[PDB]
Structure formats: structure tokens, C-alpha cells
Ligand binder design. Structure first.
Ligand code: CL
Ligand code: MG
Ligand code: ZN
Ligand code: ZN
Ligand code: ZN
Ligand code: ZN
Lengths: 285, 130
């Protein structure tokens, strides 16, 4: 069968030339025969296309020696409760030139911080993948009316991911040597992490012996929460999906079973606060 | 809405390399840990009477090679990430790549680990004789 990961969201009715298609499925039907593809002299390859590629459907279930796991067990998360940071993202829908994927719009954290980002997606070109702004619209609904003015108040992602690293460093440098993103329905949250998370083997800070929690693309260096000034990427974070703990219903209905002092759902930071709050009540009572 | 491009068998390796700092090292370490090679490549039905050159504009596989679409054999094209070239260009996209038949089970791994001889135009150790 097929998966939604890397789904082509363009509105072009024709497929890709065999030299430009990333996969056999993306090849145009005219070239397919006997389960393979054939080159057709006279049908040139496209040199002006821009195809938005969906980043929904990541599966972080790899088992590679030397690489730590991103998703951790509940008992492991309980041990590192000091590193818990609730995380939720309100997204917008791609429109006009593409359709079929969501883009991160408002990133919220249990620290109460909301970061609005410019609708940015990954666009395949005849030469490479273009990380650039894409046309997007807020999702229909009255609970999403507060997202309409945010469509023209976002920041470039190079600035957003620096603010995320700065916020997490100021919050956790005296609490933990890592971060545990507390999630509810990790699907779109994991998609948003593609914009500001890098993974790899366990590294140490370039200035001390602490483990590396941040990465800088400008210097190819690693740092902990204390020495991450200017760094733009979160390195080897951990996370867990509270929705997979056997809950029935949405986030707020389960949060309200234990807590009555958090509300205002569908705002990114408020959902992140309720997620961490529900995780605390469920794990330690 | 949209048209799927990948199969579930590649979800793990592609997600792993799409987040990694060093995607080349990530894919090599993924294979070293027993991971399945990236599938769903663009394998070409050709005459196998080609010149045998490594990277060509048309399929040039000989009797000891298989022809593939160049984009489907590039780890960075498969993961939609940045290419190591300073300009961002890709050496394989827009071309056909000839892979030895004994290595056709992992075309992405072969192009990532091998180099084309700039003198004769064939893979070093798999055709080159300079
Ligand atoms: Cl660890
Ligand atoms: Mg939410
Ligand atoms: Zn340090
Ligand atoms: Zn609460
Ligand atoms: Zn490429
Ligand atoms: Zn040679």
C-alpha cells in the first residue's frame, strides 16, 4: 500500500519524469510498464515545477545502535518529570498552489509561550527541495477564528527555531539535562519538530561535559542548555504521547477530570499546559 | 487531497534520515544496524546494451548493471533535505544512474558510498580501470 508521508500536494495532474521522480509511485503513468519504468526519448523532463511535499506521517521507531530513542516509556518520562515541557501546535491548511497538508502556524509550550511562524513548507524543485513560504489559509471553524490574524503576524522559521532553543534553554538549564515534550496526538507535533529538531548520536557540549541538547548549523557545534546562545536547533529531544495512555475523548475532557484551573482550549500554549497538567495528574496520583 | 509518493516500508528510514544532522552517516548506520535498504526506487526497463557509464542522460546500463532514475537513488532527494553541495544542486536528479546488479538491492546506499571516476565516467571499483 502507500503512506501519507512525503505526499505530493501539488495540483499538477501529470506525474514526474523518471529522472526527477523521487519514487516509482511519483513517476508519470506514461512511463510505467511491467512494474518498471521506461525512458521515452521525446518527452522532456520538467524544469519549472514546484511541488509541495507533505511532512505529515513521520515514524520514529528506528532502532540504530548509538542513536537514542525520541519517544520514551511512561516510566522513563516519570523519572525525568523535571524535563517535561508541554507542546502543541495549531496549524494552517495549504491552499492555492497546493492542497493536502498542514503547516505549523502557532507553536505553544507549557511555559505559556506562543510563537507564530510564517506558513512554510518543503517544496520539491527540479534541482532540490526548497524550504520556503507557501500559500496557506486558516482552518474553518469558530474555535479557529483567533488564527486568522496570525496568518499575517508570523516570524521566519530561522528566527522561530532560535527562540525555541532560547526558551527551552532558559527554562531547563537549572532543571534537567534534557527535554521531554509532553504531547497529545503526536502526529502534527512531530511534523512541526521537523522545522526545529535534529537527531543523531549522543554528543557532549563543546564547552563542558554535559550532554548536548542543542545544535548550531552555522558552526556545526553542539551545546547544552547553558551554552546554547545563538543555537538554532534542538538536538536529541525526548517526547511521549499522553493520548496513547488509554484515554477516551479529547484533551480538555480528560484534563477536566483532574483539574479545573486550566481552560481556553485550541490555543497552542493552553493545550500544551493542559497536556502537561494531565500527564502529571495521571502519573503521580 | 494529494498523491502519495512513498510506501510504509520506507517510513522508518526516511523519518530517521529526515531528522538527522548527518543524514549520510544516519543511513549508513541504519544499514549497519540491520535496517532494510530504501525501496520504491525508479527501476528502468532497458535493453542493457548501454555504454555502462555511471551517470547519463539516458539509461546506459550494460549486462552487469541496472538503470535507475537519478532522483530515486539520492538519499537527499528521498528525504527532501539539503544536499551537501554548497549551491544545493544534485548530481543525480535529472539523470539516470547505472548501478551494478549485485548492488541493485540498495541503489541509494551505492551512490552514497561510491564515487564516479572523473576520467572514464564509471564507478571506481565497478567499471573504472584507470
Ligand atoms: Cl540518554
Ligand atoms: Mg491544540
Ligand atoms: Zn555546556
Ligand atoms: Zn490543569
Ligand atoms: Zn538529490
Ligand atoms: Zn576511470
Amino acid at each position: 500500500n502507500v503512506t501519507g508521508l512525503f505526499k505530493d500536494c501539488s495540483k499538477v495532474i501529470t506525474g514526474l519524469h523518471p529522472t526527477q521522480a523521487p519514487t516509482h509511485l511519483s513517476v508519470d503513468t506514461k512511463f510505467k510498464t511491467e512494474g518498471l519504468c521506461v525512458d521515452i526519448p521525446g518527452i522532456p523532463k520538467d524544469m519549472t515545477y514546484r511541488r509541495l511535499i507533505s511532512m505529515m506521517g513521520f515514524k520514529m521507531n528506528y532502532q540504530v545502535n548509538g542513536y537514542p530513542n525520541m519517544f520514551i516509556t511512561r516510566e522513563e518520562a516519570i523519572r525525568h518529570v523535571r524535563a517535561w515541557i508541554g507542546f502543541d501546535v495549531e496549524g494552517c491548511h495549504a491552499t492555492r498552489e497546493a492542497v493536502g497538508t498542514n503547516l505549523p502556524l502557532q507553536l505553544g509550550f507549557s511555559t505559556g509561550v506562543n510563537l507564530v511562524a510564517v506558513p512554510t513548507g518543503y517544496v520539491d524543485t527540479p534541482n532540490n527541495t526548497d524550504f520556503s513560504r507557501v500559500s496557506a489559509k486558516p482552518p474553518p471553524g469558530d474555535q479557529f477564528k483567533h488564527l486568522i490574524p496570525l496568518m499575517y503576524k508570523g516570524l521566519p522559521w530561522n528566527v522561530v527555531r532560535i527562540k525555541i532553543v532560547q526558551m527551552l534553554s532558559d527554562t531547563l538549564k537549572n532543571l534537567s539535562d534534557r527535554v521531554v515534550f509532553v504531547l497529545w496526538a503526536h502526529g502534527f507535533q512531530l511534523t512541526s519538530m521537523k522545522y526545529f529538531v535534529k537527531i543523531g548520536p549522543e554528543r557532549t557540549c563543546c564547552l563542558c561535559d554535559r550532554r548536548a541538547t542543542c545544535f548550531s548549523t552555522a558552526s556545526d557545534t553542539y551545546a547544552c542548555w547553558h551554552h546554547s546562545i545563538g543555537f538554532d536547533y534542538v538536538y536529541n529531544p525526548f517526547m511521549i504521547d499522553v493520548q496513547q495512555w488509554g484515554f477516551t475523548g479529547n484533551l480538555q475532557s480528560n484534563h477536566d477530570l483532574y483539574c479545573q484551573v486550566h481552560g481556553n482550549a485550541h490555543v497552542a500554549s493552553c493545550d500544551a499546559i493542559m497536556t502537561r497538567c494531565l500527564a502529571v495528574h495521571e502519573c503521580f496520583v | 487531497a494529494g498523491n502519495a509518493t512513498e510506501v510504509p516500508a520506507n517510513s522508518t528510514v526516511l523519518s530517521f534520515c529526515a531528522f538527522a544532522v548527518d543524514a549520510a552517516k544516519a543511513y549508513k548506520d541504519y544499514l549497519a544496524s540491520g535496517g532494510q535498504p530504501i525501496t520504491n526506487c525508479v527501476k528502468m526497463l532497458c535493453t542493457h546494451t548501454g555504454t555502462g557509464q555511471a551517470i547519463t542522460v539516458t539509461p546506459e546500463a550494460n549486462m552487469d548493471q541496472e538503470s535507475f532514475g537519478g532522483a530515486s537513488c539520492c538519499l537527499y532527494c528521498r528525504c527532501h533535505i539539503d544536499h551537501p553541495n554548497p549551491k544545493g544542486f544534485c548530481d543525480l536528479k535529472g539523470k539516470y544512474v547505472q548501478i551494478p546488479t549485485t548492488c541493485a538491492n540498495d541503489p541509494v546506499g551505492f551512490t552514497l558510498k561510491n564515487t564516479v571516476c572523473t576520467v572514464c565516467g564509471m564507478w571506481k571499483g565497478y567499471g573504472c580501470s584507470c
